[PDB]
Amino acid sequence: AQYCSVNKDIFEVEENTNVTEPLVDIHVPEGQEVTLGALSTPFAFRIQGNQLFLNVTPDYEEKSLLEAQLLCQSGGTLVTQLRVFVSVLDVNDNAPEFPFKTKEIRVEEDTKVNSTVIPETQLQAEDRDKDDILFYTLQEMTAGASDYFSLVSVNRPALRLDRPLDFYERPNMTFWLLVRDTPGENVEPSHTATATLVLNVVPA
Numbered sequence: 651a652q653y654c655s656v657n658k659d660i661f662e663v664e665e666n667t668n669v670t671e672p673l674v675d676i677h678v679p680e681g682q683e684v685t686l687g688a689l690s691t692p693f694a695f696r697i698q699g700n701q702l703f704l705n706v707t708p709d710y711e712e713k714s715l716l717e718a719q720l721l722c723q724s725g726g727t728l729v730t731q732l733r734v735f736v737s738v739l740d741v742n743d744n745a746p747e748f749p750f751k752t753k754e755i756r757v758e759e760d761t762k763v764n765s766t767v768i769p770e771t772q773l774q775a776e777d778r779d780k781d782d783i784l785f786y787t788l789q790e791m792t793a794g795a796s797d798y799f800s801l802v803s804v805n806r807p808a809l810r811l812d813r814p815l816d817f818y819e820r821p822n823m824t825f826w827l828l829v830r831d832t833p834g835e836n837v838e839p840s841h842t843a844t845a846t847l848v849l850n851v852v853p854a
C-alpha cells in the first residue's frame with residue numbers, strides 16, 4: 651500500500667456549475683507528497699489537504715475537457731503519476747442571434763413559382779451552443795403575406811415563392827422570422843430571436 655491512488659478519476663460536471671467541494675481524496679503513502687504537474691489544464695485545479703478541487707466554473711464553449719496530472723513525489727523525486735479528467739457537459743446557455751433586425755428583399759413580379767427567393771445563408775441565425783439545431787417560423791405581419799412565401803422547412807430557412815406575385819394587388823409583404831434553439835416552443839431552457847423580413851415586389 652505504497653502507491654498514490656484515487657477511487658475515481660473521471661468526473662462529469664455541467665458547465666456553469668460551481669464545484670467548491672473536493673472532486674476526490676488522493677491516497678498518499680507516508681513519506682510522499684502530491685502536487686499538480688505541468689500537463690494539468692492551466693488555471694483549473696488545486697490540491698489542498700490531499701484533495702483535488704476545481705477552482706473555476708467550466709464553460710463547454712471555451713474547453714470541454716479538463717485534465718489534472720497528479721505527481722506523487724518522495725523527497726522531490728517522482729514515484730508515480732495519476733490522471734484525473736473532468737468531462738464538461740454542454741448546457742443550452744446561449745441564445746440564437748440573427749445578424750439583422752429588419753431587412754428588405756426586392757423580388758421581380760415575374761419570379762417563377764417554387765423559386766428560392768432568399769437562400770438559407772441570408773436568413774440563418776447562429777447559436778454559440780454549436781450542437782443546437784435551430785427551428786425557424788415565418789409569421790405574416792401584413793394579411794395574406796403567407797399566401798405568397800413559406801420556409802422550405804423549420805430547419806432550412808430558405809424563403810420560397812409559392813404563388814404568382816402581383817405588384818398592383820400586393821407590392822409589400824412583411825413577415826416576423828422567429829428562431830428557437832429547441833424543437834419545443836414551451837420547454838425550459840429555450841431561447842428565441844426575432845427579425846422582420848420585408849418583401850418588395852418590383853414591377854415588369
Ligand SMILES: [Ca+2]
Nearest residue numbers: 709710711743
Ligand atoms: Ca457556456
Ligand SMILES: [Ca+2]
Nearest residue numbers: 710741743779
Ligand atoms: Ca453551452
Ligand SMILES: [Ca+2]
Nearest residue numbers: 744779782831
Ligand atoms: Ca442555445
